[model samples]
Target: DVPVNLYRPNAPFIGKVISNEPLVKEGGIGIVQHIKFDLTGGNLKYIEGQSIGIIPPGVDKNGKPEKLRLYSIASTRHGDDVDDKTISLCVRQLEYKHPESGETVYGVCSTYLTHIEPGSEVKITGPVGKEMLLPDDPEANVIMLAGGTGITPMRTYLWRMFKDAERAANPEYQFKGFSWLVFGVPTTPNILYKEELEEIQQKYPDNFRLTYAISREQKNPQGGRMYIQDRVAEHADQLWQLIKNQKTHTYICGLRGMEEGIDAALSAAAAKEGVTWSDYQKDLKKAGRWHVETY
Candidate 1:
């Protein structure tokens, strides 16, 4: 279910930037920000996997007000401060070289978000999303596969699963089942939330497993650049076994290009069990056991 929007376009809730921290290391290639907003004057509540709309200040090419851009919420439902007074986002500044002009281009909203001043006012709306919400089952196993900024939702999940503060806040839910994260990044420096993630893995070794596929720093058995798909392939058998369990939920998020590769790898693994991958995936979707959000 989509969360009720106390604010909307034309009358967006005005919030102030609390912080805008860089997630990348010194030598990281691109800019990704961990942005936080102070929601003091508004009633904007969001769940773990929901998103908020950002209205970049400026006019578009046609001289119209810039349209809102949706970004996944990186914090839990209770907000980063656990006080319901803030919200956070993990955003990547989109950049690319134009195909014909060969000139650099930057995404307008992403640029505005990454460089916004701490005290600047921001227009925000909606805590909308339901597909990626964590299941209520405390013993359900979760398999998370993420790339780049796709770690937003997974980060929320991990916090709720292992963070002491989050755990104490939600006494109704205590994760006892296994949780594995297979993250993919271009380089070691690109690993977002590295310290927090590693700490959870170390503290809850029996319940959490963290793995990384560093494309530029690692290679697959075929001597190709390692990617999230390559890592999925390497553990496809184990993943497939978990997928077959009714209590297991799998989530995939990242660049759309990785989807086909993941499907291909899982197909081979599923075939070994005499199950058709596409058909089985359909059942998983029907059962609400498979979730995907990619762009």
Candidate 2:
């Protein structure tokens, strides 16, 4: 019953923007927006880990219609309203200076989404992806590693696992297991979905753990910015032990550069115990315990 492409690009669901609010706090580095779309007129029921395609309103330089961009759905099936009427996305406006021209180029669809006004209509398609469809076992330990806006699916999982409204909606799927979220961001202001995360951590101290890697504000052991990999290395031993548990599921969603470093850290940890990390990791994945989605 995993919902896939119910809506295609040709006959996409025309959803309306409920809000496109800025997520970054004042003095934060870049533009990250939390956009919610009202799907009242459309039908796109999705689980915690799927994504939807967005077809922007303009044509490309060649004069053909614009292509659709897939974005991870940031809310649960009931969405932010807990009313089963909306869905959300976490988008960062891509900005970079060109190598030769030195002119800044903005992400086409990302820019469009951040600037979208409430009530604006947008074409939407797909409740795609199965990577984030967490195992149904209520007692399984969940480990989440996310950097920047890659936290969307992690947020969806958390809300479904612990949010009071979500729990009320699905009284049958009670999560009685451990969940640890190791989130990395540029600064404190860049902590998207901040307050709720903190509240959950405080309220569910035994069931959930929250760790932050603030690059600018924190320091590594060697006096460098505290990147996600550095934190992983610092807690490598503990993490390895957690991964060894049969009930544990490890999920990582982050920048591509951080992926190798994460593996290296865990490899070093596994080495101390005469375990080959690569071999163990393959088994972990073979058993569907290790999950990763990098962007």
Candidate 3:
């Protein structure tokens, strides 16, 4: 199904916060939250990998309502409940030191979302985006490369693939293929949805593989900080073999900076096999097998 913008910027839906909980641990570097909202008053449905726009309450410098910021949907189509009247987001509050002022600044929308209490009203809009969508083939080999909050879409995918309730709901889509997730985070505590992810892996050991690249706590072979690309490099040969299979579809999300490192690793692997990775990747894109959604 195509995504719909049930509420536009001019007249957004007033959704109530159902729950907003911290996804990070006490010593985590930044604030990230798993926020849920009630969307029962409107037809604001969304599939996995889609995003919704949130318009925070406040005025811009020019004194107009703040523009909406889009966040990836962190829940499956059935949402947190088996019911379809809720939507969820994995939001990392943008906090950085101003270059010139040397003052700490926070993201307007993300801060508003993280600090929002249950029962508070929030302006919500579109359930848009289709680039990172799942393939119709239930047996497709899925490879996911994600960093930090980029886990949002991948979380939805895993739930669909391994959740008993989700599988029972969609009998036509029983996943019998392999799925791998190479997730990068700063530390163990920074791994969003860690418990749920591990639970799925334990239950579906044959079908799902989970890998982590903890930058601060883990080191690469070269004694450098381990990142997603480092993990990719470590498994470049295996990844290359998987990519050569027509049933394979690779998805990359999260920090845009990670793309370069990933491509470099793949390039070396492809070169060793007498294949130009850039050229081959172009064909994958043309065939809709390579999907990317980064920011």
Candidate 4:
């Protein structure tokens, strides 16, 4: 069963920052980090694809303490250490120019998280979500498509499936199924958690497949940057075949814009067989097999 709301905003749990490691390599476009918080003495438990609320320090421009912001949990339930004592997040500091002044404006929570110091206590709340849960079946095939920071939950799923520590922790859910991840990034340097992802694929070549959509370095058939959906289009036939399987689960997580292109690609593939993609998609959604969480 899914666990929800172990901690609330009104009375949040305190999680000390354990580490804040840079995920982006040299020449990476933006600041993205892999942060872990010590939950050793807290009750804020979460699943692979759930989210948690972070209340950044200090008052906002209007003189209220910064409001809670949700970030996808980037660690398996057993955590990176597999000791059930930590929770992690993959975050990119939000930077935007003001409409009038055109000056940089940093996001309250993202800025706080990316620069937070180790041993600092941060306000944490809610292990909330049910949408992105991995299937309980060990033999289930999982197709993960993600862009940017959206790879967090997908990372969690990959960790659970291929991490030696996680596999040992969950004896009942020993993954013996095929898993694929098609991750999109602006450039090679921006491929967050690239090392870990490649490590899993190298170790479990028979069970795991890794693919990258490097927007700056690669091009699509139409001669544009190779986006996630473009990569999807290239493998539409294979993906459609897998989607038609009873044990296959397809998950899409990323910027909201990618959804349309993916749907279009899949729809065109389905039409090849004289099938209506939307109707079949409805069945998958109702059956809780086609999962999507975009922002």
The 10 consecutive residues of candidate 2 with the worst lDDT sum are: 93-102
Write down the TM-score for model 4.
0.97
Clashes of each: 0, 0, 0, 0
The runs of at least 3 residues in candidate 1 whose Cα sits more than 4 Å from the true structure, single-residue gaps closed, are: 100-102
Q: Is candidate 2 or candidate 3 better by lDDT?
A: 3
lDDT of 4: 0.91
Work out the TM-score per prediction: 0.97, 0.97, 0.97, 0.97
In model 4, the runs with Cα more than 4 Å from the true position are 98-101
Expressed as tens digits, the lDDT of each residue in 1-295 for candidate 2 is 9989989998999998999999999989899999999989777899987899999888887998889998889999899989999999999998887763459988889999988899899999998998767878899999898999889899999999999998899877799999988899999999988999999999889999999999989999999999888888989999999999999999888667778989999999999999999999999998889888887
What lDDT score belongs to each candidate, Candidate 1 first? Answer: 0.90, 0.90, 0.91, 0.91
- What is the clash tally of candidate 3? 0
lDDT comparison, 1 vs 3, better candidate: 3
The residue-level lDDT of candidate 2 at 211 comes to: 92
